[PDB]
Write a protein that binds this ligand. Structure first.
Ligand code: XNP
Ligand code: U75
Length: 157
């Protein structure tokens, strides 16, 4: 399976100045649950924003840099390489990769952050006319998760 995995706000912001604009531990756990034991594919800038590979899953970075080498990271150099990756593969970021892959993926796991943040990085527009809602689960608010958020699993019609 090829899936998108993304958290975006009400205006599809996903990033600002190399950071996630919000602090939502529930969503980090969501990502850990979905992608542990599987594969994340991300563009070079997203990887550098993170700074290191995420544990207990395959980390694949897409770059044109033939010198790029990071222990624990597998490098690919073309979009076509993604399709040769075995198992459940999650397109993880950023804006550029999402723009390249949104018309190709089977389904999307979206965390909708119910706020309006300043951003410089955006998920591409999509329409629910093209996507069936397999599930929609509101995240719980608490001490450490203080912005409303909803977990969507959308499947291409
Ligand atoms: N929540 C997120 O996903 C976040 C992502 N990070 C943001 O991405 C922000 C905007 O840059 P963006 O172009 O969207 O970055 P991504 O696609 O990760 O990475 C772009 C890089 O992937 C590579 N490029 C993507 N498509 C291809 C491709 N088709 N072939 C070869 N390389 C790929 C290429 O790397 P390279 O310059 O080292 O060659 C390209 O410049 C950038 O400012 C990063 O900060 C945010 C923090 C939040
Ligand atoms: C974790 C945020 C996130 N949520 C969902 N649902 N989908 C995604 N694709 C991303 C993402 C991403 C890229 C990214 C950028 C970044 O720049 C600072 C940081 C992270 C990040 C931060 C914390 C953790 C963690 O503690 O588990 C993991 C990734 C992750």
């Amino acid at each position: 399976t090829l899936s998108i995995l993304v958290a975006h706000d009400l205006q599809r912001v996903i990033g600002f100045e190399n950071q996630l604009p919000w602090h939502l531990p529930n969503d980090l756990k969501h990502v850990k649950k979905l992608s542990t034991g599987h594969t994340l594919v991300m563009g070079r800038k997203t990887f550098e924003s993170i700074g290191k590979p995420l544990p207990n899953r395959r980390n694949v970075v897409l770059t044109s840099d033939t010198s790029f080498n990071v222990e624990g990271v597998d490098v690919i150099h073309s979009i076509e390489d993604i399709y040769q990756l075995p198992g459940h593969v999650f397109i993880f970021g950023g804006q550029t990769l999402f723009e390249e892959m949104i018309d190709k993926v089977d389904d999307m796991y979206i965390t909708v952050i119910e706020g309006k943040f300043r951003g410089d990085t955006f998920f591409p527009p999509y329409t629910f006319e093209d996507w069936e809602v397999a599930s929609s689960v509101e995240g719980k608010l608490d001490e450490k998760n203080t912005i409303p958020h909803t977990f969507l699993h959308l499947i291409r019609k």
